[PDB]
Amino acid sequence: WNSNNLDSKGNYNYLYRLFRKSNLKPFERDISTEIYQAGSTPCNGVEGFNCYFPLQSYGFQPTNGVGYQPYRVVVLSFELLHAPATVCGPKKSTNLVKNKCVNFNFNGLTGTGVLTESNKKFLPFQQFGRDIADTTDAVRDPQ
Amino acid sequence: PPAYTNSFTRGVYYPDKVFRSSVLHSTQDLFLPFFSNVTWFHAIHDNPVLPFNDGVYFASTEKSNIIRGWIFGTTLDSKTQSLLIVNNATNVVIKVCEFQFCNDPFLGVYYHKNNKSWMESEFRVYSSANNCTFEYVSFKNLREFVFKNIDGYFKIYSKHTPINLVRDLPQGFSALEPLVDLPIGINITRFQTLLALHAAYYVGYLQPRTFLLKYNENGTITDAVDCALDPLSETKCTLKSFTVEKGIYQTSNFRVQPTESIVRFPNITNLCPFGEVFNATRFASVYAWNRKRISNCVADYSVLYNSASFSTFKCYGVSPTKLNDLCFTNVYADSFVIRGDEVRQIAPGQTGKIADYNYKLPDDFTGCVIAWNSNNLDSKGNYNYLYRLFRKSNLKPFERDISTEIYQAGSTPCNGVEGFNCYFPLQSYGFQPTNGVGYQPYRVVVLSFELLHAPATVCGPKKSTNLVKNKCVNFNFNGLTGTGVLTESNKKFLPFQQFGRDIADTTDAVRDPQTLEILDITPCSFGGVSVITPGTNTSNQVAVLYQDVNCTEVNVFQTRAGCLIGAEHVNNSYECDIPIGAGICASYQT
Amino acid sequence: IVLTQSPFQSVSPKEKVTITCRASQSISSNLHWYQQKPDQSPKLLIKYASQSISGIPSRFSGSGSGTDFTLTINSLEAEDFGIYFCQQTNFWPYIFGQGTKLEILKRTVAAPSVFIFPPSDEQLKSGTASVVCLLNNFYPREAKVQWKVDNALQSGNSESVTEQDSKDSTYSLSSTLTLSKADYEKHKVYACEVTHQGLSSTKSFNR
Amino acid sequence: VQLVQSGAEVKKPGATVKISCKVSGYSFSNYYIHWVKQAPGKSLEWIGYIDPFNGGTSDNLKFKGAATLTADTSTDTAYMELSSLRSEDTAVYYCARSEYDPYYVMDYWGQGTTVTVSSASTKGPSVFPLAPSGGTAALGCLVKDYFPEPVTVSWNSGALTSGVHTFPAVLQSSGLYSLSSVVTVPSSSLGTQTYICNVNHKPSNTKVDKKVEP
Ligand SMILES: *[C@@H]1O[C@H](CO)[C@@H](O)[C@H](O)[C@H]1NC(C)=O
Ligand SMILES: *[C@@H]1O[C@H](CO)[C@@H](O)[C@H](O)[C@H]1NC(C)=O
Ligand SMILES: *[C@@H]1O[C@H](CO)[C@@H](O)[C@H](O)[C@H]1NC(C)=O
Ligand SMILES: *[C@@H]1O[C@H](CO)[C@@H](O)[C@H](O)[C@H]1NC(C)=O
Ligand SMILES: *[C@@H]1O[C@H](CO)[C@@H](O)[C@H](O)[C@H]1NC(C)=O
Ligand SMILES: *[C@@H]1O[C@H](CO)[C@@H](O)[C@H](O)[C@H]1NC(C)=O
Ligand SMILES: *[C@@H]1O[C@H](CO)[C@@H](O)[C@H](O)[C@H]1NC(C)=O
Ligand SMILES: *[C@@H]1O[C@H](CO)[C@@H](O)[C@H](O)[C@H]1NC(C)=O
Ligand SMILES: *[C@@H]1O[C@H](CO)[C@@H](O)[C@H](O)[C@H]1NC(C)=O
């Protein structure tokens, strides 16, 4: 969404990296204050010819064009399935029914089967069971 | 000094939360390889930084349980979060709390009073704590952890097991379940444990091995087999079995990797038109100048040293000397003659009569600009070299403006004729030999080369590999690339020809351009690996057969079927038992 | 693309010295001359070969003809003489002259001032002995230090500085002779001979 | 008007050295900077001229040190780095102002940058007195076994000036340096006024005091 009507006053406190010696890996934050060195001579930490401080900040004015109007980008990041669910939709845990064909979801794990009582014995930290075929054979009622 | 020891089988864990039973499940994950070399430590009478690598297998044998703490992270100045772990009197206590580290954090221990060891306030690791993005609270014995960062997850696996050995990691196998899983996300390149100061402990380094795991009926790992460990274990990874029955098994393949490379272009024959630019008869004008494609040429710049040479030699982008090593992609010589003072105006970001109007270098320009006097030739005067006095604005990057539309200072239309407020935009330099040194005509050539990111047409002044024989190399001949064993060969080309070939159209023979000679080619080696074994019930010893190779690139023996290793040849002849190839048959007995 | 200059230029006061800058193959209209005094950055006396910067003596002159450039200084003065360089111009980067050391003779001749000092009582404590012969105020510059051990020459441990300009237009110099503590006490006389123009002196002391 | 340079850097063979020359008193961007080396007892050797506005350079081929001239816009401080150092590269490095066109003069330099590429490490001097024997007495402090040059010996920390004559150094047979400094003082003052030398060797960080008595 646009921060142009609030953050822009412009605003030098919102800064970006103009140079990096490579391209970032996923969710890799570079907090290093190292100058970008474009020469062979050591910058020694200080600017000069072929020495540029790679971290630059666009001044964001409300008069700046739509291209320069600062936008606040929040990227939601979620892990999908196979893991215990913390963020959950407006779905409250249903009752459980046995010996009857049911669609189901456990902890985000989804499938369709006939849920029964079973005597196979998990180790405590475990979640799923599985069969030879990499099917989901046996699950533990989380609650 | 850090002393090593033998990891044995320790460091296998439950790679996820799945349950299984009586199944042998291959998995590929970061592990502590079997029998790897493991660093070893003390607390006696010692807690250095260690590289975090991709993770750690930590273990500490204990009686009095002195090794209670861990400090992880990149910096240790608090610029990040540093995970902290403090185990206090059996109470798990965990923090990612950020604080400014002291060099030598520790725990205090005082002898023999009502509070045993005391100094459970000792606790100077640092000045003070600021941010906490997490919080939690809660030789006889051995304690074993595994610490690795993935997906912002620092995972902790543990076994608290008793042992009887004083000296070293007990030899025996039990596998680690996940204790916690704090997804702080903070990276860790280094760490420091935390000790109680009046305790042996280990550090291995996780590595991306492939294991074959045995989940028992209860769903516990009783066994693991490291694939890359050795010949016999590669087999079990193919069969998904812990008992490999008698007989030969193809497991893997080996591809002999090449030595370095061979780039070969014929000498002296591929020459770039540098003189046809530098020495060109009449340079095009500065307002319309010659852009001559320079490509597909070994750089001749080394001949340029002996000559009348240059009023200036100026390389804006890169070093002029490294050109010897610097092979190009797009080189376009910008050829024109100008008045003396205006070689100055030729440079990225210059503002002048040349730079703004009849010729323009971009601000990002990279290349070697080259200017020299024509006062000895182009001067006689000479009005033929002409310039652009007027333009509506500055030029775009490398703008060639020939436009002869009469420049107009006023709004009243000139209709394309000269007069008041009507000026011919293109003015000529008269060149008189006695003109000032800044009025002398200078012959300018601007080489624009793009440096990297593209395949190379202009070849470096050297850019030449010597030639090697009978040794697998990765070769390039006159743009032909291939990897093989280059040998002498008797097959005789026709003169005009280039490549020999074969029934498969695959490259077979080649001709060395710099000196004509007929070189064969040959694939690397290949052949499959084959593990000849008696049943794992009899022995764990195996004899490896490299198929269809000569024994170099590897107790060795050469066969008809390939290079055999680890089986003693026998002149006696018995019944064929384990069939190998071409009559060679192996058996286990003496 | 290569230019050479006169190694040395010996002349007498008021006389005109001319120092050639000889540039092989093609030469350029421009050239620049560098006066260097010892242990100092050379000083630019000439521009385009045709011009001297302000404050530079107008007695200094330079020019060129054919491929030859010449540094011509009229009426040399005792402060003037120094090392000379000439720039190449355009034609790829500039090879300066090999240097031209200018001397001005006719200065008066005087004997070196010799002060010898023995090895200090601190030196002998650590086992080194240096008999130090100190030379001042002699012209022109040559000296040969012959150390007389008793009456015998020392053909070893003979350290004599090279002669250089002083601030007085004299020449200051030093001669150091290293000996062992025993050797310093094993001989009667340690004599520094300094032979100047064939006329050397002596300053040997007894332990 | 001024060219201010980095200090004397002494390095090993195969090491690297970068060296600054700062511009003040004139316009930095308007003037290129030549760079001229003078080897010991040798001629002016031109390594490169640089531009303030552009980061490219023309390089005399000759010695190859991967030499890159790098100036600075804010400090007007022109670096010259010489890498892949060799014992030949021991020399004085003169930054030299230039024009912004074909015209090339240097009428003003820095003082020059003395640099030593040597496999021998810097060593501190061993200072020793010289005892005084027309009514005057000559005493001095003999400095021996130091490296590299120079060394500035004073007397009474600038309180004793008249009579102090600094004699040029010599590199003796062991690969080390020797100098002498003697002051000439009257013969009545002996013992009633303390005479003290203060020895300064910059690369080796050596400050030593001594007292000269009869
Ligand atoms: C979860 O909460 C319910 C309350 O309705 C309780 O009956 C159940 O035992 C709880 N299970 C766990 C694992 O906390
Ligand atoms: C074992 O230690 C030796 C040095 O003692 C080292 O050469 C070797 O690489 C180590 N093992 C492994 C698998 O790296
Ligand atoms: C252990 O640590 C917690 C704080 O992390 C503290 O409250 C507690 O008193 C400590 N000791 C014991 C015995 O729990
Ligand atoms: C599983 O654990 C139980 C302990 O309750 C033990 O009796 C049994 O032998 C174990 N089974 C296997 C296959 O290890
Ligand atoms: C141009 O010709 C001259 C001789 O007239 C020669 O020295 C120089 O190398 C030539 N340059 C090129 C680029 O061919
Ligand atoms: C390569 O150079 C050698 C001598 O340097 C010469 O004999 C040979 O003919 C050259 N090859 C070609 C293709 O010109
Ligand atoms: C195979 O090994 C098992 C033990 O794992 C043993 O009991 C059996 O006797 C062996 N059989 C043969 C034929 O070697
Ligand atoms: C192996 O190489 C040797 C010489 O290197 C040769 O004599 C032998 O015939 C080769 N054998 C095979 C099978 O290539
Ligand atoms: C077989 O006999 C030959 C001699 O005829 C000998 O060279 C060879 O080594 C023998 N083979 C073995 C496996 O001992």
Centre of ligand 4 to C-alpha C188, Å, is 103
- Round to whole Å and give the CA distance between B454 and C195: 73
Task: Assign B49 to helix, strand or coil.
Answer: coil
- Round to whole Å and give the CA distance between C103 and C82: 7
Å between B435 CA and nearest CA of chain C? 12
Q: How many residues does chain B have?
A: 590
- Round to whole Å and give the CA distance between A91 and D69: 68
Q: D158 and D87 in one domain? A: no
> B38 CB contacts (<8 Å, ≥6 apart)?
B4, B5, B6, B7, B57, B169, B202, B203, B204
B263 DSSP β-pair partners: B476
DSSP string, B141-188: EEEEEEEEEETTEEEEEEEEEE---SSS--S----BEEEEEE------
Tell me which of B300, B307, B310 to substitute to probe ligand 5's pocket, judged by most ligand atoms within 8 Å of the beta carbon.
B307
Q: D109 and D28 in one domain? A: yes
- How far is it between the farthest Cα atoms of chain C? 69
Q: D98 and D22 in one domain? A: yes
- Round to whole Å and give the CA distance between B233 and D89: 59
| Amino acid at position B229, single letter | L
Please classify residue C156 by burial: count the beta carbons closer than 10 Å to its beta carbon, then call 0-12 exposed, 13-18 middle and 19+ buried: exposed
Q: C141 and C198 in one domain? A: yes
Closest residue in D to A38 (Cα) is D55
Q: How many helices (H) and strands (E) does chain B have?
A: 3, 41
Q: What is the dihedral of CA C132, C135, C141, C142, to 10 degrees?
A: -40
| Inter-chain touch A130–B18, beta carbons under 8 Å | yes
Q: C59 and C132 in one domain? A: no
> A133 CB contacts (<8 Å, ≥6 apart)?
none
Q: D88 and D34 in one domain? A: yes
Half-sphere exposure of residue D96: CA atoms within 13 angstroms, side-chain side: 26
Chain B residues with beta carbon closer than 8 angstroms to that of D56: 314-318
Q: D109 and D76 in one domain? A: yes
Q: C96 and C12 in one domain? A: yes
Q: What CATH number is attached to the domain comprising C46?
A: 2.60.40.10
Instruction: Indicate the residue of A38, A41, A51 with minimum beta-carbon distance to D81.
Output: A41
| Inter-chain touch A127–B17, beta carbons under 8 Å | yes
- How far is it between the farthest Cα atoms of chain D? 66
DSSP string, B342-359: GSTT-STT--SHIIIII-
Q: Atom 6, ligand 9: which residue's CA is nearest?
A: B571
> B446 CB contacts (<8 Å, ≥6 apart)?
B333, B334, B335, B346, B361, B367, B368, B369, B370
Do D144 and D124 meet the contact criterion of CB atoms below 8 Å apart? no
Do C123 and D128 meet the contact criterion of CB atoms below 8 Å apart? yes
D89 backbone dihedrals φ, ψ, rounded to 5°:
-60, -10
Count the domains in chain C.
Answer: 2
Count the domains in chain D.
Answer: 2
Q: What is the dihedral of CA B322, B326, B328, B334, to 10 degrees?
A: 10
- Round to whole Å and give the CA distance between B171 and B191: 27
DSSP classification of residue B382: B
- Round to whole Å and give the CA distance between B362 and B398: 7
Closest CA to C88 of D82, D43, D22: D43
B457 backbone dihedrals φ, ψ, rounded to 5°:
-95, -60
- Round to whole Å and give the CA distance between D57 and B46: 52
Q: D146 and D74 in one domain? A: no
| Inter-chain touch A127–B18, beta carbons under 8 Å | yes
Task: Assign B236 to helix, strand or coil.
Answer: helix
Domain end (from C104, C137, C172)? C104
User: Taking the mean position of all CA atoms in its chain, how far away is CA C3?
Assistant: 24
Do B439 and B277 meet the contact criterion of CB atoms below 8 Å apart? no
N- to C-terminal Cα separation, chain A: 39
Q: D112 and D130 in one domain? A: no
Q: Which ligand is in closest contact with the Cα of A92?
A: 1
Q: And the tokens for B490?
A: 């008797």
What Cα–Cα distance (Å) separates residue A107 from each residue in A133, B179, B206, B337, B544?
22, 20, 30, 78, 48
Query: Cβ of D173 under 8 Å from any chain C Cβ?
Result: yes
Q: D75 and D8 in one domain? A: yes
- List residues of chain B with CB under 8 Å from any CB of chain C: 305-306, 308-313, 372-373, 437
Centre of ligand 4 to C-alpha B23, Å, is 16
- Round to whole Å and give the CA distance between B149 and D179: 63
Task: Assign C183 to helix, strand or coil.
Answer: helix
**CATH code, residues B5-253:** 2.60.120.960
Domain end (from C79, C104, C129)? C104
> C120 CB contacts (<8 Å, ≥6 apart)?
D128, D129, D130, D131, D142
Chains that touch B (3 or more CB pairs under 8 A): A, C, D
Chain A residues with beta carbon closer than 8 angstroms to that of B19: 120, 122-123, 126-130, 138
B228 backbone dihedrals φ, ψ, rounded to 5°:
-70, -5
Q: And the tokens for D81?
A: 């780095």
Chain B residues with beta carbon closer than 8 angstroms to that of C93: 313
User: Taking the mean position of all CA atoms in its chain, how far away is CA B555?
Assistant: 36
- Three-state secondary structure of chain A: CECCCCCCCCCCCCCEECCCCCCCCCCCCCCCCCCEECCCCCCCCCCECCEECCEECCCCCCCCCCCCCCECCCCCCCCCCCCCCCCCCCCCCCCCCCCCEEEEEECCEEEEEECCCCCCCCCCCCCEECCCCCCCCCECCCC
| Inter-chain touch D68–A42, beta carbons under 8 Å | no
- Round to whole Å and give the CA distance between C73 and C66: 20
- Round to whole Å and give the CA distance between B272 and B266: 13
| Amino acid at position B367, single letter | G
Q: And the tokens for D113?
A: 């940058």
- Round to whole Å and give the CA distance between B37 and B535: 29
What Cα–Cα distance (Å) separates residue D2 from each residue in D25, D96, D104, D110?
6, 11, 18, 7
Q: Tell me the pairing of strands C144-149 and C189-196.
A: antiparallel
DSSP E strand stretches across B227-280: 247-253, 262-264
| Amino acid at position B584, single letter | I
- Round to whole Å and give the CA distance between C110 and C168: 12
Å between A53 CA and nearest CA of chain D? 13
What Cα–Cα distance (Å) separates residue D41 from each residue in B540, D80, D116?
76, 22, 14
D144 backbone dihedrals φ, ψ, rounded to 5°:
-135, 155
Q: And the tokens for C182?
A: 């025993």
Do D36 and D44 meet the contact criterion of CB atoms below 8 Å apart? yes
Q: D87 and D70 in one domain? A: yes
Å between D205 CA and nearest CA of chain A? 23
- Round to whole Å and give the CA distance between C86 and C88: 7
Å between B341 CA and nearest CA of chain D? 6
Q: Which ligand is in closest contact with the Cα of B560?
A: 8
In a mutagenesis test of the A interface, which of B13, B14, B16, B17 is the best target, namely the one with the most A β-carbons within 10 Å? B17
Q: How many residues does chain A have?
A: 143
B249 DSSP β-pair partners: B531
Q: C117 and C99 in one domain? A: no
Do D137 and D190 meet the contact criterion of CB atoms below 8 Å apart? yes
> B142 CB contacts (<8 Å, ≥6 apart)?
B59, B60, B61, B62, B159, B160, B161, B162, B163, B169, B170
Query: B121 in ligand 3 pocket by Cβ < 6 Å?
Result: no
- CA geometry: angle D93, D95, D97, nearest 5 deg: 160
Q: And the tokens for B226?
A: 């490291």
Closest residue in D to C30 (Cα) is D103
In a mutagenesis test of the D interface, which of B303, B312, B314, B321 is the best target, namely the one with the most D β-carbons within 10 Å? B321
Q: D137 and D89 in one domain? A: no
Do B7 and B35 meet the contact criterion of CB atoms below 8 Å apart? yes
DSSP string, chain D: -EEEE---EEE-TT--EEEEEEEESS-STT--EEEEEE-TTS-EEEEEEE-SS---EEE--SS-S--EEE--SSS-EEEEEE-S--GGG-EEEEEEE--SSS----S-B-S-EEEEE-SSPPB--EEEEE-----EEEEEEEEEEEBSS-EEEEEGGGT--TT-EEPPPEE-TTS-EEEEEEEEEESSSTTTS-EEEEEEETTTTEEEEEEE--
Tell me which of B84, B85, B91, B138 to substitute to probe ligand 3's pocket, judged by most ligand atoms within 8 Å of the beta carbon.
B91
Interface contacts (B, C; CB < 8 Å): 22
Å between C74 CA and nearest CA of chain B? 28
C71 DSSP β-pair partners: C19, C62
- Round to whole Å and give the CA distance between B357 and B346: 12
Q: Which helix (DSSP H) or strand (DSSP E) does residue B239 occupy? A: helix B231-239
> B12 CB contacts (<8 Å, ≥6 apart)?
B31, B32, B173, B175, B176, B211, B213, B221, B224
Q: Atom 11, ligand 9: which residue's CA is nearest?
A: B571
Do B485 and B521 meet the contact criterion of CB atoms below 8 Å apart? yes
Q: What CATH number is attached to the domain comprising D11?
A: 2.60.40.10
The Cβ of residue A28 has, within 10 Å, a number of other Cβ atoms equal to 9
CB crowding A47-56: b at 16 or more within 10 Å, else e: bbbbbbebbe
Q: C16 and C52 in one domain? A: yes
- Round to whole Å and give the CA distance between C68 and C28: 10
In a mutagenesis test of the D interface, which of A36, A37, A40, A41 is the best target, namely the one with the most D β-carbons within 10 Å? A41
Domain end (from D56, D86, D117)? D117
Closest CA to B186 of B342, B271, B74: B74
Chain D residues with beta carbon closer than 8 angstroms to that of B322: 66
> A95 CB contacts (<8 Å, ≥6 apart)?
none
> C188 CB contacts (<8 Å, ≥6 apart)?
C150, C206
Residues with CB under 6 A from ligand 2: B 4, 36-37
C119 backbone dihedrals φ, ψ, rounded to 5°:
-60, 135
Q: Which helix (DSSP H) or strand (DSSP E) does residue B233 occupy? A: helix B231-239
User: Taking the mean position of all CA atoms in its chain, how far away is CA D101?
Assistant: 32
Do C94 and C28 meet the contact criterion of CB atoms below 8 Å apart? no
- Round to whole Å and give the CA distance between A3 and A23: 27
Q: C127 and C38 in one domain? A: no
Query: Cβ of C91 under 8 Å from any chain B Cβ?
Result: yes
Q: How many residues does chain C have?
A: 207
Do B74 and B188 meet the contact criterion of CB atoms below 8 Å apart? yes
Closest CA to B31 of B13, B58, B5, B52: B13
> B268 CB contacts (<8 Å, ≥6 apart)?
none
Domain extent for D100: 2-117
Q: D132 and D53 in one domain? A: no
Residues with CB under 6 A from ligand 5: B 274-275, 278-279, 303-304, 307
- Round to whole Å and give the CA distance between C132 and B521: 77
| Amino acid at position B329, single letter | T
Chain B residues with beta carbon closer than 8 angstroms to that of C1: 306, 309
Centre of ligand 6 to C-alpha B514, Å, is 5
CB crowding B526-556: b at 16 or more within 10 Å, else e: ebebbbbbbebeeeeebbbbbbebeeeeeee
Q: After which residues is chain D broken (C to N over 2.5 A)?
A: 133
Q: And the tokens for B233?
A: 């274990």
> Dihedral of CA B221/B227/B230/B231: which sign?
positive
- Round to whole Å and give the CA distance between D16 and D117: 9
In a mutagenesis test of the C interface, which of B304, B309, B374 is the best target, namely the one with the most C β-carbons within 10 Å? B309
* Resolved by: cryo-EM
Domain end (from D54, D82, D117)? D117
- Round to whole Å and give the CA distance between D119 and D13: 6
Domain end (from D50, D84, D117)? D117
Half-sphere exposure of residue C68: CA atoms within 13 angstroms, side-chain side: 7
What Cα–Cα distance (Å) separates residue C156 from each residue in B571, C159, C201?
78, 9, 20
Radius of gyration of chain C (CA): 23
| Inter-chain touch B19–A130, beta carbons under 8 Å | yes
Q: C14 and C87 in one domain? A: yes
Domain end (from C104, C127, C148)? C104
| Inter-chain touch D167–C173, beta carbons under 8 Å | yes
Domain extent for C138: 113-206
Resolution given for this structure, in angstroms: 3.5
Please classify residue D107 by burial: count the beta carbons closer than 10 Å to its beta carbon, then call 0-12 exposed, 13-18 middle and 19+ buried: middle
Closest residue in C to D38 (Cα) is C41
C143 backbone dihedrals φ, ψ, rounded to 5°:
-155, 145
Chain B residues with beta carbon closer than 8 angstroms to that of D66: 319, 321-322
Q: D198 and D132 in one domain? A: yes
DSSP classification of residue B486: -
Closest CA to D76 of D121, D22, D34, D130: D22
- Round to whole Å and give the CA distance between D177 and D169: 6
